[PDB]
Amino acid sequence: GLSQGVEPDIGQTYFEESRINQD
C-alpha cells in the first residue's frame, strides 16, 4: 500500500486511495 484505506498492504499503509480534497 501507499495511503490511508481499508486494506493494509506493506509498512503502515493500505491503498493509494483517491483522496481528492479542497476543504
Coordinates of C-alpha atoms in Angstrom, one line a residue:
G1 CA 0.0 0.0 0.0
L2 CA 0.7 3.7 -0.3
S3 CA -2.0 5.7 1.5
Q4 CA -4.9 5.5 4.0
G5 CA -7.5 2.7 3.5
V6 CA -9.4 -0.4 4.5
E7 CA -6.7 -3.0 3.5
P8 CA -3.2 -2.7 5.0
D9 CA -0.6 -3.7 2.4
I10 CA 3.1 -3.1 3.4
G11 CA 4.8 -0.9 6.0
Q12 CA 2.0 1.0 7.7
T13 CA -0.4 2.0 4.8
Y14 CA -3.2 0.4 2.8
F15 CA -4.2 1.6 -0.7
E16 CA -3.3 4.7 -2.9
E17 CA -7.0 5.7 -2.2
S18 CA -8.3 8.6 -4.3
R19 CA -8.3 11.2 -1.5
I20 CA -9.3 14.3 -3.6
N21 CA -9.9 17.5 -1.5
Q22 CA -10.5 21.2 -1.4
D23 CA -12.0 21.9 2.0

